[PDB]
Amino acid sequence: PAQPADFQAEVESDTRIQLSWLLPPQERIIMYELVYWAAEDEDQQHKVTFDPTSSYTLEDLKPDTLYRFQLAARSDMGVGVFTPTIEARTAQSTPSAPPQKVMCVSMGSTTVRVSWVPPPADSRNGVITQYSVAYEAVDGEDRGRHVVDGISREHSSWDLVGLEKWTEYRVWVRAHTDVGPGPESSPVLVRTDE
Template sequence: SWESQMVDNNQLTTISELTPHTIYTIRVQAFTSVGPGPLSAPVLVKTQQGVPSQPSNLITTDVGETSVSLQWSKPSHSGENIVSYELYWNDTYAKEKHHRRIPISESYTLSGLYPNTLYYIWLAARSQRGEGATTPPIPVRTKQYVPGAPPQNVSGVAEGPTSIRVSWEPPPAERSNGRIVYYKLHVVEASRSDSEAAEVKLNGTSFVVDELKRWTEYRIWVLAGTSVGDGPPSYPITVRTHEDVPGDPQDVKVQSINSTAIHVQWKPPVEKERNGIIRGYHIHVQETKEEGKSLLNEPMRFDVLDGAAL
């Protein structure tokens, strides 16, 4: 259909908002107060090729932990042939703008992204005359992933002969890769393998491990998890429970030396009942009747350190 443009008494005008790379037919007509005269002979003109218009319908078709699949429609006015697309994105984690030139297509998978991170993505087409208009940015958040770092500052302190309190801090926020929903605490005697460790699943960042063996070294480590799964374990720490009173000495033997002295000999408590470092012994002596049933006096106590009675 024809479109017209009114021009003052002039011999020059500019017609704008035409479609690039398109042939137009131009005819001019003069008019007076009475009315218009005849049309001039037609003149054909072709507009120049310009930069492409913006692509349309930019959407995500799949979102993963570290990648986003995109799809779009080519520009409605491309001018010259499109030679590439210019893809731009920035992220709310690194606070950086990125750019990648991609081949002619109407889909692309952007990879190498951070998990659980909000990105803004936009696109422009490029022809030989330059880059065209960009699409409006679209927001995309990548999926959560397992934590990329272990809990920090894991520490343990014995609270008694059978318990250890373990404390830690969450992984660094920038490496959590999602919301931390649990921790797993592992405890095993230092002399045993990791595969024998007991596991406790927790929500908090401290826990008292009880029902442990007295005066025993334990190896302890912690890991964090998101809804996707477990992250890496922390470096193990070693903590020893406190000492406790020992079990009874073994194989006690007594031999009379003379009328006023006896020789007493014994072995330490069995190893699993020593419950610490044996620092000495108390020897209790009390006189009894011949039958061995009645006690005749108050007991006497001798302390033995380094093999000598005090």
Template structure:
């Protein structure tokens, strides 16, 4: 049932009757299953997919999770685990990389809103293309041996590796070769008497593949509040499988609270040292690197994590001043939306509107978000504002709010409003502290 209701509580505070009105928002629900994933393009090691926007359940979709796994069962008879790729809620396409050639994959999609992940879509099958870089076709001319000759032989890379072709075939495909490797090949014919002279040596190089090992010794260090430096060394030369054209640095903001964070961003570079700029302040980032050739992207490295440096914080998000007695005011505030570091103290400022004499009080730590200013003059108007500080320094000021001490104080809610989200049937408890004389 989807509805919106007002609930009213009535209570006595001393001699005053207080009415508290709370509006219960529309119940949120999980989404319906998204439509099937559409396969747009297929390579030997990647697949491009797209999808439409599903029903969101009265809450905007925060992100999508594309899941894929090989269709074949594992050696133990079970299915392989799902691999996840996450994109933002306003994105409806993705490219899945680091797949295996000539392999069938199952793909499905989940949409996530504030309530959680909805049911998955129906599975879609995608078959990656084959790679032709591990074989070479050899052709030669018949040397004019009389009919009835048993066959020809074509040795490959080394004398001990020989392929024998029976009959009158004039070509053979050599398989299981190494990628991007030069081979020397000769062909000789033979009959019942023995083998003839070898043909001139022919050099042939297999096609490029993708690097089958990730870059090594990946390191990440902070440069400033909004930049980090990423260093690595190339994969071992025997794992290049081609000419390395460059590197993709994949980085993602990871929330300190364990949330999903941002989408993966990619920076392409040819250098072994890369600076990432425009990052969030005092934010944790996960960084991975891969090398690529003209054949495609190679194996991704294991992630490393680094945190940008601290900076001065932004302003406290909200502030209010409540009259407590004839000579005191309660100042309450909320934490900055952008703390940009560990908050070590709050600074409470106030002055009289008559004299503009500024005063400052300090609240150490980040747990206490109220302060009672005393020794004020009754009925005199004051302005109050708050700043936060990190080890870097003092941040921006909140807005200024006016208030005057009075002896007769009405009941007031001291806390700030906040949104509580939950699914249908879940229980939630909300405390509502207030201030007032008894």
């Protein structure tokens, strides 16, 4: 029941972590027992048993989450001593949800202010870096899509200026991270004040 040595975690992707360790010098190991859990949620811990191998990769994980691991080998004597716990955090990814509670109210003849709220945390998959408001006119002079990038994460509302007068618009807004942009919000209608 010797504790496995040289236990090391490697971050392969945003949802896949590879665990490696030194195989014992021909020790009569039956199975390996791996126990891991999310650092933010200690109550739910996961356990997996597998045949004697040198490495094991975990899949279907959550991005931007810290996972801690412990390993032991069970022989004909029983389950050995667990390895000292190691931790590894998954990489970031694009958001899996649009900004919620999207709204917009006309401010004047050529100004329309749009507001939103950051998406839920369980689908952010990283740090929200910026936003992007997309909109198209309907009854306006030009029916051309316009988008505004670089919307910093500090504010939750942006003012669209220079548009047409007394006309309807559709608005879209999506979250952004270093990996890429997330899904856009559902379109919301708005009519320009005159």
